[PDB]
Write a protein that binds this DNA or RNA. Structure first.
Ligand SMILES: Nc1ncnc2c1ncn2[C@@H]1O[C@H](COP(=O)(O)OP(=O)(O)OP(=O)(O)O)[C@@H](O)[C@H]1O
Ligand SMILES: [Zn+2]
Lengths: 53, 121, 320, 74
RNA sequence: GGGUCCGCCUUGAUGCCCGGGUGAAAGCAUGAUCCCGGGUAAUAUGGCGGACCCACA
C-alpha cells in the first residue's frame, strides 16, 4: 500500500510530506483487525494512558 | 513523535541498540519482525526488545511496551524501521526486533538494559 | 466536488401550524445508549483483507448483536467508508445501496504518458459514460480530480453513481491513453451521507470504546462510535408528518396527504423517500405515489407507499 | 459504411482505439475507406456522446492503421 | 382478504480472510512459504405461522 493522507488537512498524497501544509503523512488504510484480537488488552493499556482513563 | 514511544532515547543509545542487533544477528540469535518479537516476549526468550519510532499504523507495535513491562523485559526505541531492518540482516524494514541470545554483544545489552531502566523512571 | 447528496432541496410547508408533542417519541439526542445502539449505524473504516460481510459478522460477534448490515459492498482489498447499521436499524442500508460513492484510487499506467495528456483524457471520463456496449447501459461520473502524478502512478479522487466499477473505469482510461493501466489501490471516502470525518471509526477503536463502556462505565466514547439511523437517511428526500399520523404508519398504514406537515421539493412518483416526524425521527422508508406539488396541493389520497418501518409502535399513541 | 473515426493508437493490450460520435455494437465489422477488412469491435467506453471504441485487429500488422480512418461495414 | 413487525423453511469446483506453528529477483518481517485450526460465501424471491392493526391523521 502506498496511498497516504495528511492527518491535519486531509490531503491524499503518495509523498511522505504533505504538498499543501508540509507535514508528515500517514498511510491511508487502517491496520489489520483480528476477531481473536490476541493483544487487545495491551493495546487498551496504551489507549487508556493516551485518553487519560 | 508517536504516542507508543514511552521515553526519549539519546542518539548514542539508539546506535548502541542497533549495534547490539548487528552483532547478535551473526554471533547469537535474534527474532525480527513484530510477530516474531512478540512471540519471543510471550515465551520469555527475549532479553532486549528494539522498537522503531516510525511505525505507521502505530497499532502494529503499540501492544509491545506494556507487554514488555508485564513480562519484565527491557525495551529500547530506534528512529528508523529501515535502519533496524538492515541491522537485523534483511533487505526490508523491521518494526521491532528481539534479542534471544546476545552472543558477543552480551555486555552491550547489559549496558542498554541498565540505561533504559533509568529512562523508564 | 459535489454529489447529488450535497445539493440542498427546498422544504415546502403544507401545514404552517404543525406542532410536535414533546410527550411522545425519541429523537436521536435523547436516546439512552442501549436504544441508541438498537437504532444505530457505525461509520466504519473497513480494513483491506476481509470481505464487507466478514467485517459485519465480526461486529455482531464482538458487540453481541442479533442483527447488522452494511451500506454498499466494499471489495476485500478495498479500505474505507463502510456504514454498518445495527439491530433495528439494519435495513436502513437499503437507502445506501443506490447512493453516490466517492473514492480515492491509484492508477498505474503501463507506459509513459505526458501529464497534460493524462489530465485531458481523464477529464473526458466525467459525465455519462458507457459501462456496457450494446448487443445501452450507462453510469454517471460526477467528477475526477487528479491529485498527483508520480511517473506512471496517477492518484485521483472520483465521485460516481452507484454501480460504477472503478477497476473498469481505470482499465478504460488505460485503453484511451493507449499504454494500458490497472488499479493498484482503492479506498472509499464516501458512501452516501457517510464520509471521512470525526465519525469514521476503525474496528480497533470500536471494540476498545465498547470495552471502555463495559468495564470502565464510560459510555461517551462508544456513543460517539455509533451514529443515529437518521444519518443513513440524510441524502434522501423527506416527508415530515404530523404526530397524529405516526402511529398509523407504524401499524401498517400507508401515508395519506392530510398527514403531511412538511416535505422536500423535487419528489417524483416512484422516488425512495424517508418519512420523518417533526422531531426529525426516522419513521419509515417509502415509495412516493405522488409528486411534491401533488402532496402540497391535494387534500386526499395516498402520498407514500410505506415499504419499511423502523420506528416502534409505542413511541407515538394511536391517534387515527 | 458508417464512419467511426481516426485510429488514435494501437493499444499494447491488443486493440486499435478510435474516437467516434456514435455507439457501435459488439462484434461489428470494421473496414477502411476501400472496404478492406481491418477488425472487430470488442468494447465501447467513455462518454456516451463521444465514445472510445476498442477494435480487435484481424490483420497481420495493425500498427499501420494508426492515423487512418476506420468504418463499420453496413 | 390486506398491510406492518417478528419468527421459521433452501443451495454452493480446493478460494479468500483471521488466528496457532514456521520465519524467507517486481512481491515481501506492516509476514514469503508450507503445516494446522477456525470464520465467511447471493447483506434475494417464493412459502408457512405468530403478534399488532385495517389507520385520509
Ligand atoms: N506493459 C505492461 N504490461 C502488463 N503489465 C504491466 C505493464 N507495465 C506495468 N505493468 C504492471 O504494473 C505493475 C507495477 O510494477 P512496476 O513498477 O514494475 O511497473 P513499471 O511500469 O516498471 O513502473 P515504473 O516504471 O514506475 O517502475 C507491475 O507489477 C506490472 O504487473
Ligand atoms: Zn497537509
Amino acid at each position: 500500500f502506498r496511498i497516504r493522507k495528511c492527518p491535519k488537512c486531509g490531503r491524499y498524497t503518495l509523498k511522505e510530506v504533505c504538498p499543501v501544509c508540509g507535514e508528515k503523512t500517514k498511510v491511508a488504510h487502517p491496520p489489520r483487525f483480528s476477531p481473536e484480537d490476541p493483544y487487545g488488552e495491551y493495546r487498551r493499556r496504551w489507549k487508556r494512558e493516551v485518553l487519560g482513563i | 513523535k508517536p504516542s507508543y514511544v514511552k521515553f526519549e532515547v539519546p542518539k548514542e543509545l539508539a546506535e548502541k541498540a542497533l549495534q547490539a542487533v548487528e552483532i547478535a544477528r551473526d554471533t547469537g540469535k535474534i527474532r525480527k519482525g513484530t510477530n516474531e518479537t512478540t512471540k519471543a516476549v510471550e515465551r520469555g526468550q527475549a532479553k532486549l526488545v528494539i522498537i522503531a519510532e516510525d511505525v505507521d499504523p502505530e497499532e502494529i507495535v503499540a501492544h509491545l511496551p506494556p507487554l514488555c513491562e508485564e513480562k519484565e523485559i527491557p525495551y529500547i526505541y530506534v528512529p528508523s524501521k529501515k535502519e533496524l531492518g538492515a541491522a537485523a540482516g534483511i533487505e526490508v524494514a523491521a518494526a521491532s526486533v528481539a534479542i534471544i541470545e546476545p552472543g558477543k554483544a552480551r555486555d552491550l545489552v547489559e549496558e542498554i538494559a541498565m540505561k533504559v531502566k533509568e529512562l523508564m523512571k | 466536488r459535489i454529489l447529488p447528496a450535497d445539493i440542498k432541496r427546498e422544504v415546502l410547508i403544507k401545514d404552517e401550524n404543525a406542532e410536535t408533542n414533546p410527550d411522545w417519541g425519541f429523537p436521536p439526542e435523547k436516546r439512552p445508549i442501549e436504544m441508541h445502539i438498537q437504532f444505530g449505524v457505525i461509520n466504519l473504516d473497513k480494513p483491506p483483507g476481509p470481505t464487507s460481510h466478514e467485517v459485519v459478522a465480526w461486529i455482531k460477534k464482538i458487540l453481541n448483536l442479533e442483527k447488522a448490515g452494511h451500506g454498499g459492498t466494499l471489495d476485500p482489498k478495498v479500505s474505507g467508508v463502510l456504514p454498518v447499521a445495527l439491530e433495528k436499524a439494519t435495513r436502513v442500508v437499503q437507502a445506501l445501496l443506490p447512493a453516490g460513492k466517492e473514492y480515492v484510487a491509484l492508477m498505474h499506467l503501463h507506459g509513459d504518458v505526458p501529464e497534460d495528456k493524462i489530465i485531458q483524457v481523464m477529464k473526458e471520463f466525467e459525465g455519462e459514460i458507457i459501462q456496457r456496449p450494446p448487443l445501452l447501459r450507462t453510469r454517471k461520473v460526477y467528477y475526477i480530480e487528479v491529485l498527483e502524478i508520480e511517473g506512471r502512478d496517477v492518484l485521483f479522487r472520483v465521485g460516481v453513481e452507484a454501480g460504477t466499477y472503478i477497476r473498469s473505469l481505470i482499465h478504460h482510461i488505460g485503453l484511451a491513453l493507449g499504454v494500458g493501466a490497472h488499479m493498484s489501490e482503492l479506498r472509499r471516502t464516501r458512501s452516501g451521507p457517510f464520509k471521512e470525518d470525526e465519525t469514521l471509526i476503525t474496528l480497533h477503536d470500536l471494540v476498545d470504546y465498547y470495552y471502555f463502556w463495559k468495564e470502565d462505565g464510560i459510555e461517551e466514547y462508544f456513543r460517539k462510535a455509533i451514529q443515529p439511523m437518521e444519518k443513513a437517511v440524510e441524502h434522501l428526500p423527506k416527508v415530515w408528518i404530523k404526530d397524529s399520523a405516526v402511529a398509523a404508519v407504524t401499524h401498517g398504514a400507508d401515508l395519506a396527504v392530510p398527514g403531511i406537515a412538511k416535505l422536500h421539493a423535487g419528489i417524483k412518483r416512484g422516488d425512495l423517500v424517508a418519512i420523518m416526524t417533526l422531531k426529525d425521527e426516522l419513521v419509515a422508508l417509502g415509495k412516493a405515489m405522488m409528486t411534491s406539488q401533488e402532496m402540497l396541493e391535494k387534500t386526499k389520497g395516498i402520498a407514500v407507499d410505506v415499504e419499511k418501518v423502523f420506528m416502534p409502535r409505542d413511541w407515538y399513541p394511536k391517534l387515527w | 459504411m458508417k464512419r467511426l473515426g481516426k485510429v488514435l493508437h494501437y493499444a499494447k493490450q491488443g486493440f486499435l482505439i478510435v474516437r467516434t460520435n456514435w455507439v457501435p455494437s459488439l462484434n461489428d465489422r470494421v473496414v477502411d475507406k476501400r472496404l478492406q477488412f481491418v477488425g472487430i469491435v470488442k468494447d465501447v467506453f467513455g462518454p456516451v456522446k463521444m465514445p472510445y471504441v476498442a477494435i480487435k485487429p484481424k490483420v497481420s500488422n495493425p500498427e499501420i492503421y494508426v492515423g487512418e480512418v476506420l468504418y463499420v461495414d453496413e
